[PDB]
């Protein structure tokens, strides 16, 4: 099950990148967790697509935060 399911999550996210190539830079999965790697001027359209599509309707912000790595030129990453 779980091997099949993580292989399914990979394919879903490949679809999400192919549907919006202008905004999504990357995606990474690590153990049934999906991270979408997005530019800062690219926040609002991707979040409308995540709220609004019927395949992709997330509807509910849980928690957001930043994390600093001072060793990068763009310091904070907002998740």
């Amino acid at each position: 099950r779980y091997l099949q399911h993580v292989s399914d999550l990979h394919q879903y996210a490949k679809y999400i990148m192919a549907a919006l190539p202008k905004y999504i830079q990357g995606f990474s999965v690590w153990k049934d967790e999906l991270t979408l790697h997005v530019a800062p001027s690219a926040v609002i359209p991707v979040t409308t697509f995540l709220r609004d599509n019927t395949s992709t309707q997330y509807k509910s912000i849980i928690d957001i935060t930043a994390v600093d790595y001072p060793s990068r030129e763009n310091r904070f990453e907002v998740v």
Partner: protein, 123 residues
């Protein structure tokens, strides 16, 4: 270089009094591992009067310096130096000292000495 010492909320004295130091941590001479010798440590040189002093009741090591236990880890020297002069600090980059490559053979442990032996291995 944008001067970010006025936006980070740090006081002025932390930018115009104290010197800071870039260094890579050296390999420990005690144990033979090398894991902590890849990241670049940003650490503050101590101040004269406010480092540490003994308490009178028990003997607690009370301090007045507040950056005494802060360190940072960076990936590269360039990221560390861009962060150091972006916050407006006075650094000192300490360059690392590696080991020299020298070819070793186990067959070095015995060769035919033609003159004086001048040495006796033990193994």
């Amino acid at each position: 270089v944008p001067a970010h010492e006025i936006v980070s909320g740090a006081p002025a004295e932390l930018s115009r009094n104290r010197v800071v130091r870039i260094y890579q941590q050296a390999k420990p001479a005690t144990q033979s591992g090398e894991y902590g010798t890849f990241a670049w440590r940003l650490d503050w040189d101590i101040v004269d009067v406010a480092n540490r002093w003994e308490n009178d009741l028990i003997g607690w090591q009370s301090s007045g310096d507040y950056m005494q236990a802060t360190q940072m880890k960076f990936t590269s020297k360039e990221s560390a130096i861009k962060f150091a002069n972006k916050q407006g600090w006075d650094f000192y980059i300490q360059e690392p000292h590696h080991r020299k490559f020298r070819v070793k053979q186990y067959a070095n442990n015995f060769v035919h000495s033609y003159g004086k032996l001048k040495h006796i291995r033990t193994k």
